[PDB]
Paper text:
We initially determined the crystal structure of UBA6 in complex with ATP from an orthorhombic crystal form (space group P21221) at a resolution of 3.3 Å. Subsequently, crystals belonging to space group C2 became available, which diffracted anisotropically to 2.7/3.8 Å and, due to the higher resolution, will be described here. However, the accessory components, the FCCH and SCCH domains as well as the UFD, display enhanced variability around this conserved core. Due to the limited resolution of the UBA6-ATP complex the metal coordination cannot be fully resolved, however, a Mg2+-ion was modeled at the Mg(1) site, while a Ca2+-ion appears to be present in the Mg(2) site. In the B-chain there are extensive contacts involving a hydrophobic core formed by F217, L232 and I287 of the FCCH domain and the aliphatic part of S737 as well as P738 of the SCCH domain and two ion pairs involving E249 (FCCH) and R740 (SCCH) as well as R248 (FCCH) and E876 (SCCH).
The covalent modification of target proteins with ubiquitin or ubiquitin-like modifiers is initiated by E1 activating enzymes, which typically transfer a single modifier onto cognate conjugating enzymes. UBA6 is an unusual E1 since it activates two highly distinct modifiers, ubiquitin and FAT10. Subsequently, the E1 catalytic cysteine attacks the ubiquitin-AMP intermediate to form a thioester bond between the cysteine and the C-terminal glycine of ubiquitin, resulting in the formation of a covalent E1~ubiquitin adduct.
Numbering used by the authors: 35 to 801, 818 to 1031, 1035 to 1051
The structure:
C-alpha cells in the first residue's frame, strides 16, 4: 500500500475517490462474465479506473449481431469466429497500461467447480442464466472474506442490476465529504475532563462518536489522540481524565473520525422473492416491482423454452403474461401485473439498446469500485433502468419494423424500430466540445448509427484543445501516442473505426461569436440536433442563444465527480438554459484578498493572482510598451516633451531593476519574500495596531479579521527554500537568464544569499518627483547600454497546472502557505492547492458514461419528434446511489394584459420602409401584437425611453439614422420592454426590416 499513484494519469479520479481507495483498487482482481455491450462497457470503465487485474470471460463466438453492440469488434473477427473475449482483449488492454487484462474461454456449467473464483475480490455476471447466477451468488457470499457479487443485464429497453456484498459489508466513507471540524474554546482538568466549543457554532455530536484533536496549546498531550466522547450538552462533551495533563491555554481543533459502518445484504434468492429498492419516483412507486416481475418471467420463459420471446408472437407474449401473473402470486405483496411492461419486454427482449447499456455499465462499474474500496454507499440491491418512453410514444407499431434486416442495426431495430433507426441515420448533429462526454457521445452515435447515410447524414464535432495524459483517464478514444494532438480529429478517426459508414466533420474551432461566420444561422437550421459537452456556462449560454434563434433542440449534460445531470431543451415545448437563475459562484472582497484573509482559499487566490501578475501581465505590458514606443531614447524624449505614455513608470522600473544573472534572480526572490511575508504584516500592524478599537465604540480585529505576524526567512525551513527556488526560476525564465540544477542547490543559494544579503528594516509608509526618478532611471540605462533591444524584451509565462516541472503550482502553494502562516490559517497540500488554483473539477469515467448514455436516449426521442411528456431531465449521484428522472421544465408563456402571449422561442417581426420613425415602430408593434413598446434598445445602445431627456425629439427621428448597422443588413434586431405591471416588463425580440419594396 506504498505504491506511488500516477497523478499525471489519475489526477481528476484522485479527487473523486482518494488515494487510499485507489491503493485498495491497486490490489483488486475482478472477474467479469459475458462480453456483450454491457460487459465491454463495464470492463472499459474498470480498466480505465485502474483495477489491478480484470479477467474477461465469454464462451460465445463473434457474430454480425455483436458488431452493433460491441465497439471494439471487427468483421474479420466475425468471419474467423474468434471468441468475443479474446478478440477485444488487446483493445481493452490499451485503455490502461498499468492494468493486467486476461481472457477466459472456459465453459461455465452447473458441473463446473466454482473454486477458481476465490482469487477474485469481486464477480460481475452478464448474459448468464438465473439458476447459475444463484449458485455463484451462494458460493461468493459464503466465502470469508466474501467475494462481492454483482449481476447486470440489459434486455431490450429494460435493464436489471443487482448487488450483494455479503451479509455484512463495511462502508468506510458514506458521502465522500471531508470530516467536520469543531473548534475548542476550553478543556477542563478533571475526571472526566470536559471539552467546550465556540458558542457561535454547536458541535452537534453523539454520545458514542470518536474525535481526533490537534493544535491545542497548554494541554499539548491531547494533540494526536483519538477519544470516544460523551455529549453533555450542545457545545460540550466529556473525553476522559485530564487532571494529570498540563493546564489548557487556548486553541484546539476536534475532527470527527469516520467509523466504519455496517450494511447488510440478503442473497439473490431471498431478494428475488422479496426485493429491496430505493424508490425515487413516487409518481410511479410500483413501477420497479412490476419490471422485476416481468424480467423474472422472462428468465422463467428462457428456462422453459430455452429461448426468448419472438417479436409479434402472441403465444409467447401470452405465456410471458401467464408466468408474470404466477410470479406476482408468489411475491409477498401480491403486486398487480403490468401488461404494458410484459408486452414490451416480450417485444424487445431479443433486442439490445446500447445507450441504456452504457448507463447501466457506468452504474455497475461504480458498484465494483464500491465493493473493492468501500468508498461510497452501495446500491441497496436492485436498480431497474428503463427506456419505456422511447417505445410508448411510437403508438402501436408494426412488428415488421422491429424484425431483423441482416445488418448491424438489428439490435437497435428490435428496441426502437426501423423508422427511427433510419431517422437516426439521416441526422445532422452538432457536438460542441469533444471531452469525456463528447467521446462517450461519439461512441453512442457510432453504435446508434447516427449520420451513417452518406447522402443526408453529418456529425459535426468541434474542439479547440489538444489531448493530455489526465484526459486519458476518462476519454477512451484517445491514447498516449495521441498526446499533444487535436481532440476532435483523433476522436473522429477512432469513431470511424467503430463504424466505417459514419460521416464526421471535425473542426479545431471554439464556438464563440468570433466563429459565428463558420457556425451561422444557415448551419444551425441545417442541424437537426445540437449537443453540448462543454465545461463552462458562458459557452452553454452562447450555444443556447444560437439554438433559440434558429428554433433547434439542444441537449446539455455535465459531470461533477460522482454527480451528473442531463437537460433537454426542445423548441416551443421546454424552457431554455438561459432561463436559469444564473447565480455568480463567489465574489471575494478585495479587502479579504489583499489585507484580511480568513481562509486558505483566499490565500490560494492571492498566490494565483501574484503568479499571473509577476510572470504574465507585467511581461506583456513591458513588451507592448517598448514595441509601441520603439527606442528607449524616443521614450525618454517623449517623456521630457510631455507626451503621455501609459504604464511608463512600472516599465522603466522593470528596466532599471532587470536581473542580469542567476544571483540577481535569487536576490529578487528573497526580497519579494521579505516584502510579501514580513513587510506587509508590519505595515498592516502599523496602520491598524491590535489595540485600536472604534468601529462600534470599541471594535477592530474581530473574529473575521486575523492579525498578521511577520515571518523570518530560514533557508533550512522547507517552504522558504521552495518559494525561493521556484520564484527565482520563474523570474529567470521571464528575464531569459540561464540556470542549472547546480544553481538551484541550497548550498549555492546560501552562498549567494547569506554572503550578500541587504535587508533594511523599512519604516511604515504612513508612519513630479516620481516622473524625474523615472527619467533618471531611463537616462542611466540608455547611458550604460543596459537598454538594448535585448533588454527591452521579456518572456511571458502561461499558467499550466498539469506540468510538475514548470514550478507554477509549487510557487503558488509555497506563497499561499507562507501567507497563511503569516495570518495563521492552516496550510493546504500541493494537490489540494492545485485543484483550487486551477479550478480542476473531479471526474471519473463511470459518471460520464452514465450521463452520456442517458443523453443519447433523449436524442433518440428528439429525433422521433416525441411529445413533451416523453422527454425527461436527469440528476444522478452514484455515491448514494440515486437516479432522479423528472419531466423537463415546461415552456413558460407570458402575456401582458390585452397582449399576444410570448415565449422564449417566439420573435415578433415588424416591417420598415424608407420613410419610417421611432413613433411608427412603436405604433406598429401596438397594431400587430396589441401591446405598446415603452422601451427600445439595440445592443447596449439605448434608442428610446419615455422618461428621458429629449424623448420627443427621438420619437420623430428617422430609423435609419437612429440605428447604426454598418453591415447595412436587411434587418436589425431590437429589444422591447412594455410598461404594464411598478417596473418595466421584458418582451419578445422584435426584428425590424429596412427593405420591403411593397
Ligand atoms: N466554446 C467551446 N467550443 C468548443 N469546445 C469547447 C468550448 N469550451 C470548452 N470546450 C471544450 O469542452 C470540453 C470539456 O470537456 P472536459 O471537461 O474534459 O475538459 P478538459 O479540458 O479535458 O477538462 P480537465 O481540465 O478536467 O481535463 C474540452 O475539450 C474543451 O476543450
Ligand atoms: Ca413511463
Ligand atoms: Ca486540455
Ligand atoms: Cl510585486
Ligand atoms: Mg473542462
Amino acid at each position: 500500500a506504498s505504491v506511488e499513484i500516477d497523478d499525471a494519469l489519475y489526477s481528476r479520479q484522485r479527487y473523486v475517490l482518494g488515494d487510499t481507495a485507489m491503493q485498495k483498487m491497486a490490489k483488486s482482481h475482478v472477474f467479469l462474465s459475458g462480453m456483450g455491450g454491457l460487459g465491454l462497457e463495464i470492463a472499459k470503465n474498470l480498466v480505465l479506473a485502474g483495477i489491478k487485474a480484470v479477467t474477461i470471460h465469454d464462451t460465445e463466438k463473434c457474430q454480425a449481431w455483436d458488431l452493433g453492440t460491441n465497439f471494439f469488434l471487427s468483421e474479420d473477427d466475425v468471419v474467423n469466429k474468434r471468441n468475443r473475449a479474446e478478440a477485444v482483449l488487446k483493445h481493452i488492454a490499451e485503455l490502461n497500461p498499468y492494468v493486467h487484462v486476461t481472457s477466459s474461454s472456459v465453459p461455465f456449467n452447473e458441473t463446473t467447480d466454482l473454486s477458481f473464483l476465490d482469487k477474485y475480490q469481486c464477480v460481475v455476471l452478464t448474459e448468464m442464466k438465473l439458476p447459475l447466477q444463484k449458485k455463484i451468488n451462494d458460493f461468493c457470499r459464503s466465502q470469508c472474506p466474501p467475494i462481492k457479487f454483482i449481476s447486470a443485464d440489459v434486455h431490450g429497453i429494460w435493464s436489471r442490476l443487482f448487488c450483494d456484498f455479503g451479509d455484512e459489508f463495511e462502508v468506510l466513507d458514506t458521502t465522500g465529504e471531508e470530516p467536520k471540524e469543531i473548534f475548542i474554546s476550553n478543556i477542563t482538568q478533571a475526571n472526566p475532563g470536559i471539552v467546550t466549543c465556540l458558542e457561535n457554532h454547536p458541535h452537534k455530536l453523539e454520545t458514542g462518536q470518536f474525535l481526533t484533536f490537534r493544535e491545542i496549546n497548554g494541554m499539548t498531550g491531547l494533540n494526536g489522540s483519538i477519544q470516544q466522547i460523551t455529549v453533555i450538552s450542545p457545545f460540550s462533551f466529556s473525553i476522559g481524565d485530564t487532571t494529570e495533563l498540563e493546564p489548557y491555554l487556548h486553541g484546539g481543533i476536534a475532527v470527527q473520525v469516520k467509523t466504519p459502518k455496517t450494511v447488510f445484504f440478503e442473497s439473490l434468492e431471498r431478494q428475488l422473492k422479496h426485493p429491496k429498492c430505493l424508490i425515487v419516483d413516487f409518481s410511479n412507486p410500483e413501477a420497479p416491482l412490476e419490471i422485476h416481475t416481468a424480467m423474472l418471467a422472462l428468465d422463467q420463459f428462457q428456462e422453459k423454452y430455452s429461448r426468448k420471446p419472438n417479436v409479434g408472437c402472441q403465444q409467447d407474449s401470452e405465456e410471458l403474461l401467464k408466468l408474470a401473473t404466477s410470479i406476482s402470486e408468489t411475491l409477498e405483496e401480491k403486486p398487480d401485473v403490468n401488461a404494458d411492461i410484459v408486452h414490451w419486454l416480450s417485444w424487445t427482449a431479443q433486442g439490445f439498446l446500447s445507450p441504456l447499456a452504457a448507463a447501466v455499465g457506468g452504474v455497475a462499474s461504480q458498484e465494483v469500485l464500491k465493493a473493492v474500496t468501500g468508498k461510497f454507499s452501495p446500491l441497496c440491491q436492485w436498480l431497474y433502468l428503463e427506456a419505456a418512453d422511447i417505445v410508448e410514444s411510437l403508438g402501436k407499431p408494426e412488428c415488421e419494423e422491429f424484425l431483423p434486416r441482416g445488418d448491424r442495426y438489428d439490435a437497435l431495430r428490435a428496441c426502437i424500430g426501423d423508422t427511427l433507426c433510419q431517422k437516426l441515420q439521416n441526422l445532422n448533429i452538432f457536438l460542441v466540445g469533444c471531452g469525456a462526454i463528447g467521446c462517450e457521445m461519439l461512441k453512442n452515435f457510432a453504435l446508434l448509427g447516427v449520420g451513417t447515410s452518406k447522402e443526408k447524414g453529418m456529425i459535426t464535432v468541434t474542439d479547440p484543445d489538444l489531448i493530455e495524459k489526465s484526459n486519458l483517464n476518462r476519454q477512451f478514444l484517445f491514447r498516449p501516442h495521441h498526446i499533444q494532438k487535436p481532440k476532435s480529429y483523433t476522436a473522429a478517426d477512432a469513431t470511424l473505426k467503430i463504424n466505417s459508414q459514419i460521416k464526421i466533420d471535425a473542426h479545431l474551432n471554439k464556438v464563440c461569436p468570433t466563429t459565428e461566420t463558420i457556425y451561422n444561422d444557415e448551419f444551425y437550421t441545417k442541424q437537426d440536433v445540437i449537443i453540448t459537452a462543454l465545461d463552462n456556462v458562458e459557452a452553454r449560454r452562447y450555444v443556447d442563444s444560437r439554438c433559440l434563434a434558429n428554433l433547434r433542440p439542444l441537449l446539455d449534460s455535465g459531470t461533477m465527480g460522482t454527480k451528473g445531470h442531463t437537460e433537454v431543451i426542445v423548441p416551443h415545448l421546454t424552457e431554455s438554459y438561459n432561463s436559469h437563475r444564473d447565480p455568480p459562484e463567489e465574489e471575494i472582497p478585495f479587502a479579504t484578498l489583499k489585507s484580511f484573509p480568513a481562509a486558505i482559499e483566499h490565500t490560494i487566490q492571492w498566490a494565483r493572482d501574484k503568479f499571473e501578475s509577476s510572470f504574465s501581465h507585467k511581461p506583456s505590458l513591458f513588451n507592448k510598451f517598448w514595441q509601441t514606443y520603439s527606442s528607449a531614447e524616443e521614450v525618454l524624449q517623449k517623456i521630457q516633451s510631455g507626451h503621455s505614455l501609459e504604464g511608463c513608470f512600472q516599465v522603466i522600473k522593470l528596466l532599471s531593476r532587470r536581473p542580469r544573472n542567476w544571483s540577481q534572480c535569487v536576490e529578487l526572490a528573497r526580497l519579494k519574500f521579505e516584502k510579501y511575508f514580513n513587510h506587509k504584516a508590519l505595515q498592516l500592524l502599523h496602520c491598524f495596531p491590535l489595540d485600536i478599537r472604534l468601529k462600534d465604540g470599541s471594535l477592530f480585529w474581530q473574529s473575521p479579521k486575523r492579525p498578521p505576524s511577520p515571518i523570518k526567512f530560514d533557508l533550512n525551513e522547507p517552504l522558504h527554500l521552495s518559494f525561493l527556488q521556484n520564484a527565482a526560476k520563474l523570474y529567470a525564465t521571464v528575464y531569459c537568464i540561464p540556470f542549472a540544477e547546480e544553481d538551484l542547490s541550497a548550498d549555492a543559494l546560501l552562498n549567494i544569499l547569506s554572503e550578500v544579503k541587504i535587508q533594511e528594516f523599512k519604516p511604515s509608509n504612513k508612519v513630479s518627483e516620481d516622473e524625474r526618478n523615472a527619467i533618471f532611471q531611463l537616462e542611466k540605462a540608455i547611458l550604460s547600454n543596459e537598454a538594448t533591444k535585448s533588454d527591452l524584451q521579456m518572456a511571458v509565462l502561461s499558467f499550466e497546472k498539469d506540468d510538475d516541472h514548470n514550478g507554477h503550482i509549487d510557487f503558488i502553494t509555497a506563497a499561499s502557505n507562507l501567507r497563511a502562516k503569516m495570518y495563521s490559517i492552516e496550510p493546504a497540500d500541493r494537490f489540494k492547492t492545485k485543484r483550487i488554483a486551477g479550478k480542476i473539477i473531479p471526474a471519473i469515467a463511470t459518471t460520464t458514461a452514465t450521463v452520456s448514455g442517458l443523453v443519447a436516449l433523449e436524442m433518440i426521442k428528439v429525433t422521433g419528434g416525441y411529445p413533451f411528456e416523453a422527454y425527461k431531465n436527469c440528476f444522478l449521484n452514484l455515491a448514494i446511489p440515486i437516479v432522479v428522472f423528472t419531466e423537463t421544465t415546461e415552456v413558460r408563456k407570458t402575456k401582458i394584459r390585452n397582449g399576444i402571449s410570448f415565449t422564449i422561442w417566439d420573435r415578433w417581426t415588424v416591417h420598415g420602409k424608407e420613410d419610417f420613425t421611432l413613433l411608427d415602430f412603436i405604433n406598429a408593434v401596438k397594431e400587430k401584437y396589441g401591446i405598446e413598446p415603452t422601451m427600445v434598445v439595440q445592443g447596449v445602445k439605448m434608442l428610446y425611453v419615455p422618461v428621458m431627456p429629449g424623448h420627443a425629439k427621438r420619437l420623430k427621428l428617422t430609423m435609419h439614422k437612429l440605428v447604426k448597422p454598418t453591415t447595412e443588413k436587411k434587418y436589425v434586431d431590437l429589444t422591447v420592454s412594455f410598461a404594464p405591471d411598478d417596473e418595466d416588463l421584458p418582451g419578445p425580440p422584435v426584428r425590424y426590416y429596412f427593405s420591403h419594396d411593397t
